[PDB]
User: Fold this.
Amino acid sequence: VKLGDIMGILNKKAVHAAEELRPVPGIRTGDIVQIRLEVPENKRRLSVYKGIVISRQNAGIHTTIRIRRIIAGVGVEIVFPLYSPNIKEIKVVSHRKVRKARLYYLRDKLPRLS
Amino acid sequence: MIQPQTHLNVADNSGARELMCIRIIGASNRRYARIGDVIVAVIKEAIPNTPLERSEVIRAVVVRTCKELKRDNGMIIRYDDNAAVIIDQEGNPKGTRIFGAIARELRQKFAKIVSLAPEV
Amino acid sequence: SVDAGIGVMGTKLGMMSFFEEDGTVVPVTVIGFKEGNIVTQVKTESTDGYNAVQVGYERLRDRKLTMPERGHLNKAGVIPMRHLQEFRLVSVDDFTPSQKLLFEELFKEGDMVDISGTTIGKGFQGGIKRHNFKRGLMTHGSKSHRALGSIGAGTTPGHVYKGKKMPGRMGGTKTKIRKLKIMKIDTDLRVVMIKGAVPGKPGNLLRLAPAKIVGKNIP
Amino acid sequence: AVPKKRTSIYKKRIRKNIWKKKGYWAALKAFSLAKSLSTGNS
Amino acid sequence: MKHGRKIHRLSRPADQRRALLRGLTTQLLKHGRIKTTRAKASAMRKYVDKMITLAKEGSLHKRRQALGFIYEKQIVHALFAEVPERYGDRNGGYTRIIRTLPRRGDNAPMAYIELV
RNA sequence: ACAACUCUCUCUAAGGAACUCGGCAAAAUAGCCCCGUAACUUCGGGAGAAGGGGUGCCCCCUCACAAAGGGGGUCGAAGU
RNA sequence: UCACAUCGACGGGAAGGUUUGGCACCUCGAUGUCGGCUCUUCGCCACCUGGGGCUGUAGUAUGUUCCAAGGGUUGGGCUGU
RNA sequence: AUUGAGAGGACCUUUCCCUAGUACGAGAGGACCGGGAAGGACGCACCUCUGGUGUACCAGUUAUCGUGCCCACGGUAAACGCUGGGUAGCCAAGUGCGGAGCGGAUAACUGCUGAAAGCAUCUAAGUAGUAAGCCCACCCCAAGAUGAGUGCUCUCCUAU
RNA sequence: GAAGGUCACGGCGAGACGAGCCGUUAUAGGUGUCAAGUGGAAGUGCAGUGAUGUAUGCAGCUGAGGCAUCCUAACAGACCCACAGACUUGAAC
Assistant:
C-alpha cells in the first residue's frame, strides 16, 4: 500500500462500510428530503426532519447536506452528516428544478419558498 | 454571537416586541453570547397595554442565533433570526407560551422553556 | 529531557473525520510509517555520561548517504536511513541495537501521546501576526495602521530593552503538542489515528512518545 | 534620519570590500560556465 | 505566504499575463522556435502543451476552444491537420527549453522554447 | 521574486457606531413612468418632501399615446 | 463594663519625592507642553487572587492588621479633558 | 548524534455539583477540609467539520468592439464590467491541546524538646509543619559555555 | 583529487537575499486517470409564430490535490581541501 494513497483507501473503507449499514439515495441540490434519526437523549423517540437540500458539500466520510425549512414561523437550516450512524432513514420525497450548486440565495428570498 | 448593542427579537408573549442587548452574564470578559447564555437587555418596544413597559432593563436568555451552534453528532443549526426569551429571574419566562423552535441544549439549565415549546 | 517511554518516529498523512457507534464526530490525524523505527545505538552512565537510545527511520538507496553515516549505521547492522533521533530514558536495558520497535505492541490505545514536530513556516512576519499585537485606528486620520507604535520609554532607559517583541520569522520550529488521544490502531494498514491536530503539513517527521506527566518522571 | 559623523576611513574600506567580493563570486561562477561551454550539453 | 500556490505571474496583472501567454503561444506555434526569458518560457509549457493536447481531438467544439485562445485563425487550422500525424506517438511534453546567455541591457536571463 | 511594512484598490461569517473630539472615512440611495406628499408659510414655497408600486426578452389590439399604453407569454438569485 | 476589637482629641517624631510651592544650578546658535492610540517595563505604601494573627470571631459575611508584586485589575453614557 | 552552563515562554482564574443541608445555629440561614464540573481570559498548534477570502476555476448577465455574416467565442468597461458559486493555500467566528508535583528551601505564623533565669520561653544547640511568592520540574533555544563539552563513524593520495 | 564541503542543474508544505530541505535517471512540468469545484456545453434532433424549452449527457469546462508513466527539462560539468597532527610531563605493553 502506497503512503500517499492511504487517506484515499481509508475513506474507501469508511464510506463503503457505512453504506452497507443503509444504502443512501442520489440526493443533490433542490430536492425535498425527509430524514429521521435515532436521537441519543436516552430515548429512541425518532425525531423526523424535513425540507429542501440547498447544498451538498462532497467530502468523503463527512459528506454532508444542508437542509433548509421554514419551521413553525421561523426559517431554519440544519446540515446533516450524510453517513452518520445516528441517522436512520433518508427518503427523497420530491424534486424542485433548480439550477445552481448551492442555494444560499434562498435564505433571503421569501417564506413562501419552503 | 449576540453582543452589546445587538437588537434581538422576543420569542415569547411576555408583551415585549423587541430587545436590545447590553451585557453578557455568566463567564465574565465574554465577547458575545451564543445560544444558552443569559444576557441583559433594554426593551426597545412593546405592545401598548402589557405589564412590561418600554425602556426597562431586564434579563433575557438567547434561544435563536444566526451563528451555527454545533452538536457532537456533527449536525449544525443556523436560524434566520437572533432572538431571546425574557427570563423572569431563576426559572420560567414571564409568558406561559413560547414560539418558533428551540434546541435540546437549552433543556439542561432551562427545563421549563422546552416544556412550553411548539416544535423542539 | 528524560522521556516517559521510548518514542517512535512517524509521518503525518492529513486529517480524517472518524465516527463512533454513538455518532460522535471526531477530527483525527492519520499517521503513517516507513521502514523501521530500528534501534541504532545505546548510551550509558558507564561510557557516555547518560542513558539513551538512538532510533533511525525512513529507508534509502545507500548512495544518498555519506561514508561516516554509512559506517555508523553499518556498525549496527541496519538498513540505510535518515533521521537518527535519541530518547533519553532512566531505563537503559532491553534496547540492544538492530531491534525493531513495534508501535502496535508498545502503545496499546487510549494512551494520550505527546507528539513533537517542526511546524508550518510563515516567513518573516509582522508584530500583529507574530506576537498578537493590536493595530491602531483606520480612519480619524491615523497614519499609524499596522505597526509597533512606540518601542521603548525615554531618556531614562535610554535604549531598547532586550527581548523586546518585534517583527521576525514566525514558524518552522519544534513544538510538542502533548496529551493526545489514540483513537484507533489499524493492524491491517500500520496507521495510527490520533485525535486532533499535529504540527506541520502532510510529510513531516513526528516524534511519537507517551505522556510526560510529573507523576512519571523525576521529583 | 541623518548621520552624526562620518565613517571616514577603514570602515568604508571594510564595507566596500564585501561588495567587491560579490564581484568575486560572480567571477568564479562565470569561470565555471566556460568549461561547461566546452564539450557536450545535449 | 505563497504556500502551495502555483502560478507563473510574469511580473504582470491578469490583464496582461494572459495577453502575454496567448501571443507568445501563437508566435511559438507559427515559427516553431522563439527566443525569450526563462520565466516567460517556463510558464509557457502549460499552454502550448494544452493546445497540442486540444489538437488531438479535432472536433467542432475543440477547434472553437482553441480558436478563442490563439487570435489568428490560420495558425490553429495548421494544427488539427498537422498535429495527429507528427505527434500521434508522443504522449504529453511537446516542448523543449534550451537556455542561452543573458540579455545585454539588463542582465535578463534568457532561453529558447520550440516544439519537440 | 511574491517576506514584514506603506500606499492605490477588491471582498468579507455574527453584530451594526459598540469607533471617535465628531459617523471623519467608507457604505447605502440613484434613470425613467405611475400612485402618493405633512408641520409651517412672506401664499411664490416647503417638495424630488416623506412613502410606495412598475421596468429585461418575445407575441399581440389602433383610419395616429417616440419598443407606446394595454393584454398575454418566457428567462435569471437579480431587468435603470 | 474596658484608652490599646474598632476609632482616637490636645500635642510630639519620622520617612517618601507622585501634588501645590521656594531657589534660578544644566539647556534661549530650540530638548515640541495636555489628553487619546500603539507598545512597554518597573515600585509597593496590596483592589482581587495565595497563606496568616486579633476580633465587640456562633456559622455565613465582615472589620483590623502581618507575609506575599507570580498573575490579573471590564464594556459604555457625558466632558478636549 | 546529543550533554547542559546559561537564557527565555509558560505555572492565571470561575461558578456549579458531591461532601452536606452535614458541623454551627432557637430559627433565619449555612461552613472549614478534600474530590469531581462545565466556562472566562490567555498561550501553542491545525484545517476534518462550519465558514471568509480565493482577479485559477466554473456559471449567469449589461454595454459596445472584434472574430466576413447567423451560431459560437475573444477584448475592454483601472490593478475581476457587474453579480452568483468555489478546490488547494492562507485565515478565524471553526478544531484540537495546554496550566498538572505527597520535589526542595523559605516568608508571616503555629510548634516540639529546652536553658540562660531550679519556674517559664518556637532559640541561644537541634528539629517539624508551613504560601499563586523563590529554586528544580513543564515547553522552546543553547558549547562564540574562547570554560569553544561528550559520543558514534569516515578520511589522510600526490601534479593529483 | 581524501572524507567532505561549495557551486551549477529541477524544485519545495523552506524562503526578503543568504539559509534550510528534497531531487539530479518520479524532482518540477506535461500526459493518463481519479477525488473535488461548477452546474447541464457545443453540435444535432424534436416542440413552440417567437423569447425559449427539451433529449442525446451527474454532461462540458476546470482539476493549486492524490496516484500512475521518464514524453520534456535535471545535460554539461566546475571550485575548495589533506605534514597520520608543533611543545612538556607522568602512568602503560
In short: The first strand of chain A starts at residue 31 and ends at 37. Residues 99-100, 103-106, 108-109 of chain A lie near RNA strand F (CB under 10 Å from a C1').
